[PDB]
Structures are given as structure tokens and as C-alpha cells.
Ligand binder design. Structure first.
Ligand SMILES: N[C@@H](CCCC[NH3+])C(=O)O
Length: 247
């Protein structure tokens, strides 16, 4: 019912209704800038979300790859999870690439960021899927290579089972000497809970972030659609953490 050919109009209609209050949008922008994070319930309609979730589950079944690694560029923090890479989503999907190209979605995110939110210059980071499903699974402390990440909560357990997001904004990623523990000591951590159906926006290049490990065998699945800034387009970027976690 929802397809690459009609999803753009649905995204624009929802944004026009959901974010009609200019003062609410101003507050969302200020929260995003202050905290590096803002929750955006209803960013897409429930129907669009469900269509995107259905595609996500299909991609996981065909393509998911188990990883159990630790990355020196983020202080040897763990990535214990299963993943689907951008190449497989671009090859097999249709809805997810169409949402990623959404003029209306990028235009609303530009309002929050107060600058142009645009396509990522490295194709392989535009969108990925992670599935946490075993006790101990986690997306450990890290930064993103690009500026504007929207996380889609495709599945999530009750928060006492793990999966809470934690953030420290206004930091920076030095891959040669990331100093994760020094940042935790210098600044407070904000923790945010999410349920299935939620969406949130994250300033991934300057917000140090992670998910709290699962403490039971439960399923948490996110889609990560990652957009970029003007400055992101010309900065020299290495992709080692991306190459390590996704096919
Ligand atoms: N740099 C991230 C890779 C995933 C980013 C997704 N856009 C990390 O270290 O986990």
C-alpha cells in the first residue's frame, strides 16, 4: 500500500500536521542543539513507520551478519549485535532508499538543525540496520562520522532489559586518541528511553553515545538513516568502524 512512489506525499502531509506549532518546533531545535539529541515521536506517521519496519524485518532475515568485535578507534568499545549493511538495503529495499531521499523529511530536519541536512557523501553510511538479540548485546560508546542521525525503533524490549540510549554532547571524535573515559568524567551523561515506534534525532559527530547492554535475551532493532552537513561533504573521512561492522 505504501510504496516508493507514494511515500513522499505521506511524509510531507504528516510533517505539515504534526509540526504545525512553530513554538514546539523551536523547542525541539533548541533541545537538539543543547543536548545533541531530540525525541521526535510522530516524525513519520504510524502507517509509514510500519511499512518501513516490515521492509527492515525482511532485510534482516535475508542479510543479517553476526558481529562480536571491539573497535580501537572508540577506545575498544564493543559492537555485539547483528547488522545489515547499506549495500544490501540499497539492493533489496525500496521504501528505505525513498525515505532517505525525502525532500520533506530533510527539510524538516534542516529546520531543527538550522542548516542544510543533505545526503551523506559516503553511500555506505546512508542507512544501516542493527539487531541486538542476545544478553550482553550493545552498541558501545562511539561517535558517528557524519552529523545528522535519525534512529527508528523497529523493535525494543522493556527498558529494564537494556537498550537505553546514553549521550554526552559537544564532544569530538579523535580516532587516534578517543579518550572516552576522560569525556565521561568531564561531563554528565543523559540517558533516554525509547519504545517501539519511536524516532529520534542525534547529532552523531559531536555526541558521544551508546546503548545500554541487554541484560536478557530480548530483541532490539533499529534502522539508522544518517544524513550530513555541508562541512561533512568536504572533510576527509576514514571508514574503518563502518567497514568493520557491515558487509
Ligand atoms: N561509527 C559508528 C558506526 C555506525 C554509524 C552508523 N551511521 C560506530 O563506531 O559504531
Amino acid at each position: 500500500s505504501i510504496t516508493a512512489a507514494n511515500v513522499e506525499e505521506l511524509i510531507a502531509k504528516n510533517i505539515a500536521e504534526r509540526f504545525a506549532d512553530d513554538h514546539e518546533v523551536l523547542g525541539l531545535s533548541q533541545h537538539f542543539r543543547r543536548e545533541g539529541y531530540v525525541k521526535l515521536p510522530g516524525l513519520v506517521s504510524p502507517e509509514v513507520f510500519d511499512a518501513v519496519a516490515a521492509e527492515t524485518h525482511q532485510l534482516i532475515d535475508t542479510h543479517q551478519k553476526r558481529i562480536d568485535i571491539r573497535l580501537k578507534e572508540t577506545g575498544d568499545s564493543p559492537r555485539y549485535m547483528s547488522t545489515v549493511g547499506q549495500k544490501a538495503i540499497a539492493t533489496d529495499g525500496s521504501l528505505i532508499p525513498a525515505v532517505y531521499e525525502s525532500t520533506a523529511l530533510k527539510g524538516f530536519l534542516s529546520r531543527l538543525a538550522k542548516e542544510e541536512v543533505m545526503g551523506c557523501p559516503w553511500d555506505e553510511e546512508k542507512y544501516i540496520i542493527t539487531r541486538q538479540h542476545q544478553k550482553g548485546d550493545t552498541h558501545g560508546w562511539h561517535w558517528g562520522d557524519f552529523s545528522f542521525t535519525v534512529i527508528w525503533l523497529i523493535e525494543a524490549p522493556s527498558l529494564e532489559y537494556g537498550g537505553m540510549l546514553q549521550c554526552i554532547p559537544h564532544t569530538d571524535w579523535n580516532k587516534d586518541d578517543p579518550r572516552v573515559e576522560d569525556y565521561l568524567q568531564k561531563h554528565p551523561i543523559r540517558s533516554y528511553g525509547h519504545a517501539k515506534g519511536d524516532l529520534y534525532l542525534l547529532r552523531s559527530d559531536t555526541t558521544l553515545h551508546r546503548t545500554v547492554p541487554l541484560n536478557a535475551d530480548r530483541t532490539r532493532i533499529i534502522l539508522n538513516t544518517c544524513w550530513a552537513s555541508r562541512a561533512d561533504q568536504q572533510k576527509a573521512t576514514t571508514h574503518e568502524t563502518m567497514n568493520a561492522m557491515f558487509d
